[PDB]
Design an enzyme around this catalytic site. Structure first.
Site, PDB file in Angstrom:
ATOM      1  N   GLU A  14       0.810  -1.221   0.000  1.00 16.59           N
ATOM      2  CA  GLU A  14       0.000   0.000   0.000  1.00 16.59           C
ATOM      3  C   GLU A  14       0.840   1.267   0.000  1.00 16.59           C
ATOM      4  O   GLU A  14       0.441   2.264  -0.589  1.00 16.59           O
ATOM      5  CB  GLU A  14      -0.947  -0.009   1.205  1.00 16.59           C
ATOM      6  CG  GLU A  14      -2.388   0.280   0.835  1.00 16.59           C
ATOM      7  CD  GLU A  14      -3.399  -0.278   1.815  1.00 16.59           C
ATOM      8  OE1 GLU A  14      -3.555   0.316   2.907  1.00 16.59           O
ATOM      9  OE2 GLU A  14      -4.042  -1.304   1.489  1.00 16.59           O
ATOM     10  N   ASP A  23      -6.952  11.085   0.481  1.00 17.54           N
ATOM     11  CA  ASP A  23      -7.089   9.808  -0.220  1.00 17.54           C
ATOM     12  C   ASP A  23      -8.054   9.949  -1.408  1.00 17.54           C
ATOM     13  O   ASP A  23      -8.560  11.048  -1.641  1.00 17.54           O
ATOM     14  CB  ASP A  23      -7.484   8.658   0.747  1.00 17.54           C
ATOM     15  CG  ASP A  23      -8.935   8.558   1.218  1.00 17.54           C
ATOM     16  OD1 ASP A  23      -9.728   9.496   0.945  1.00 17.54           O
ATOM     17  OD2 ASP A  23      -9.274   7.550   1.875  1.00 17.54           O
TER      18      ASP A  23
END
Ligand SMILES: *C[C@H](CCN1CCOCC1)C(=O)NC[C@@H](NC(=O)[C@H](Cc1nc2ccc(C(C)C)cc2s1)NC(=O)CC)C1CCCCC1
EC number: 3.2.1.17
Length: 357
Positions: A14, A23
């Site tokens: 990730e 995000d």
């Protein structure tokens, strides 16, 4: 809690961010996908982070602080898995290594996303590792993130960390070719030059500046071990040949204006000397000739104007605004709004350039 390898597995899959970021869904995140708040307030996000860490972080944390947050997310994920009727049986039946691969899946697509793999989850519970491995590879999950998914599938197939250990071996061996003999934790002048030779590129070329942008590199003529490792893994490359094959894709991206703007603004930060807020004139011109080549009619007349009338550092805002200037400016400069909001430097350029047509 202490009675309960996973951090490194998701640091690779990730990524680890040490500064507060937005995000996909627009939420304030840090570390390995740690959500700080649903609030659009950065003040609220910083308040949450400060409370969780126990210091005035100002939105910047250490890798150890990121790990503290990561262990809290693992615990929350595991609790959620155990309250799920579709995930609990599979989880309970699995060994420690394969549980980590399942937690990895939950981190990526959430409980509902994972529960959708009913046939594969059943094969895993039945310890039909080969059948589960082939079946999970048919999914969209395999095409959306091929490098990450192959690593997770390998974890389920073998019950070992071999996918993660072997990637790190290949990258460490590759790194040793470039590391500075006087400083093992960085790639020096010689190493950067070797890296560029292996890619068959000149270090002053646009292709190398595009690569720096992709590696999110901090400063020209500097290349840390962390920049190399994180860059190669994020780009899904474990060799120079694999990185070489990604270059055309990076080029196509720059045809989209949003990506080009992000790259153009990054160039300023990369080019400048650390500890200085501005970019020295000579360096600004050298980078402008690289990034605004074929995008700005008045590029040479602009360089001439600066070398003769400015003779000083270029501020970041002026650098950013030059791109907007080059896009809108008519070939005869008749559409220039002198009573507008452009930097004084661009107003002076238009005044200098207009008599010379
Ligand atoms: C650092 C070097 C020192 C100054 N030199 C000139 C005279 O005094 C002594 C020697 C310098 O500033 N050179 C300017 C030159 N820059 C480059 O060639 C850089 C070098 C690279 N840095 C990195 C960092 C990381 C990576 C990885 C992501 C692989 C790669 C590279 S190459 N190249 C670039 O910035 C790419 C364009 C000039 C190049 C042309 C533009 C003006 C600066």
């Amino acid at each position: 809690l202490y009675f309960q390898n996973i951090f490194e597995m998701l640091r690779i899959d990730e990524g680890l961010r040490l500064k507060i970021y937005k995000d996909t869904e627009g939420y304030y995140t840090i570390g390995i996908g740690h959500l700080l708040t649903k609030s659009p307030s950065l003040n609220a996000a910083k308040s949450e982070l400060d409370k969780a860490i126990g210091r005035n972080t100002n939105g910047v944390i250490t890798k150890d602080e990121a790990e503290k947050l990561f262990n809290q997310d693992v615990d929350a994920a595991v609790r959620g898995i155990l309250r799920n009727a579709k995930l609990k049986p599979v989880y309970d039946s699995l060994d420690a290594v394969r549980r980590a691969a399942l937690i990895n899946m939950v981190f990526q697509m959430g409980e509902t996303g994972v529960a959708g793999f009913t046939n594969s989850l059943r094969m895993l519970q039945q310890k039909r590792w080969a059948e589960a491995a082939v079946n999970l590879a048919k999914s969209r999950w395999y095409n959306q993130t091929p490098n990450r998914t192959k690593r997770v599938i390998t974890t389920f197939a073998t019950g070992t960390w071999d996918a993660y250990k072997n990637l790190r071996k290949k990258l460490e061996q590759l790194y040793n070719r470039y590391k500075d003999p006087q400083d093992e934790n960085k790639i020096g002048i010689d190493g950067i030059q070797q890296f560029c030779d292996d890619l068959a590129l000149d270090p002053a070329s646009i292709s190398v500046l595009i690569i720096a942008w992709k590696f999110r590199a901090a400063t020209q003529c500097e290349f840390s071990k962390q920049e190399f490792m994180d860059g190669m893994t994020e780009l899904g490359c474990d060799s120079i040949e694999k990185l070489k094959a990604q270059i055309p894709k990076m080029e196509q991206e720059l045809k989209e204006p949003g990506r080009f703007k992000d790259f153009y603004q990054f160039t300023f930060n990369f080019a400048k000397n650390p500890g200085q807020k501005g970019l020295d004139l000579e360096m600004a011109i050298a980078y402008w000739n690289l990034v605004l080549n074929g995008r700005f009619k008045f590029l040479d007349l602009w360089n001439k104007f600066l070398l003769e009338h400015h003779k000083r550092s270029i501020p970041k805002d002026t650098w950013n605004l030059l791109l907007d200037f080059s896009t809108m400016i008519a070939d005869d400069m008749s559409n220039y709004d002198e009573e507008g909001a452009w930097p004084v430097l661009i107003d002076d350029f238009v005044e200098f350039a207009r008599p010379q047509i």
